[PDB]
């Protein structure tokens, strides 16, 4: 029934809001708080390692929130441990990149980072100009689409609940959940006259994979660097 679909939509939105670190209202409010040129130079002078240490700690923190998101989804806990993990491995980082568009401000090309917004220059110490620049462009594109909270919640749900991931044991159960999500999302897109938006999405697979690699590089080589 139509009412049943709506229960699913509200439920997915509930769980997404519950597992966002800051409420979207708060992110928008704090757009005004902007790093001064001196604070920017503060970050720019840090060592490569220190900057990646901080960045990876935040990448990690976001992934954990994405895991919480999955826990609160309708059929996800019912899946076997193997499946829960397979889906999170394949999709968690991509979810993190989508959730990031919320914290990006398109007006001034700046991003929430550790209490205040600042530009791309804030991350010079990381050294990976091509990668950082791409993460900015990706977020810029998503912002241009003006995804609402509901659209992000449902789309990120579908990023996780994908039935074609190699390694899944209970493929059918996962199809059941994915199909119900595509049903609810399709209905929501129809009522809001937003059917075409998913065509406009920029590709996120290569980018998320690079972020995962950087996160892993830091865990592997921690003994070579200072205690944290």
């Amino acid at each position: 029934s139509l009412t049943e679909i709506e229960h699913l939509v509200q439920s997915v939105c509930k769980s997404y809001r519950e597992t966002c670190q800051l409420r979207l209202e708060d992110l928008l409010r704090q757009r005004s708080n902007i790093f001064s040129r001196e604070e920017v130079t503060g970050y720019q002078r840090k060592s490569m390692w220190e900057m990646w240490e901080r960045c990876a700690h935040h990448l990690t923190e976001a992934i954990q929130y994405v895991v919480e998101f999955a826990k609160r989804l309708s059929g996800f806990m019912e899946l076997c441990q193997n499946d829960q993990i397979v889906l999170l491995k394949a999709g968690a980082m991509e979810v993190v990149l989508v959730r990031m568009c919320r914290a990006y401000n398109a007006d001034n090309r700046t991003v929430f980072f550790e209490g205040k917004y600042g530009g791309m220059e804030l991350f010079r110490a990381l050294g990976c100009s091509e990668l950082i620049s791409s993460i900015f462009d990706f977020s810029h594109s998503l912002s241009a689409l003006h995804f609402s909270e509901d659209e992000i919640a449902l789309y990120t749900a579908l990023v996780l609940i994908n039935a074609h991931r190699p390694g899944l044991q209970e493929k059918r159960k996962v199809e059941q959940l994915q199909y119900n999500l595509e049903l609810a999302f399709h209905h929501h897109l129809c009522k809001t006259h937003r059917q075409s938006i998913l065509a406009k999405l920029p590709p996120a697979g290569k980018l998320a994979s690079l972020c995962s690699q950087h996160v892993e590089r830091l865990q592997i080589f921690q003994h070579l660097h200072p205690i944290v």
């Binding site: 990690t60 954990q64 441990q81 996160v215 892993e216 865990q219």
Partner: peptide, 13 residues
Amino acid sequence: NMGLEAIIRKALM
């Protein structure tokens, strides 16, 4: 990625 997996396992349990 195995690094990602470690974070996820811990978070789940």
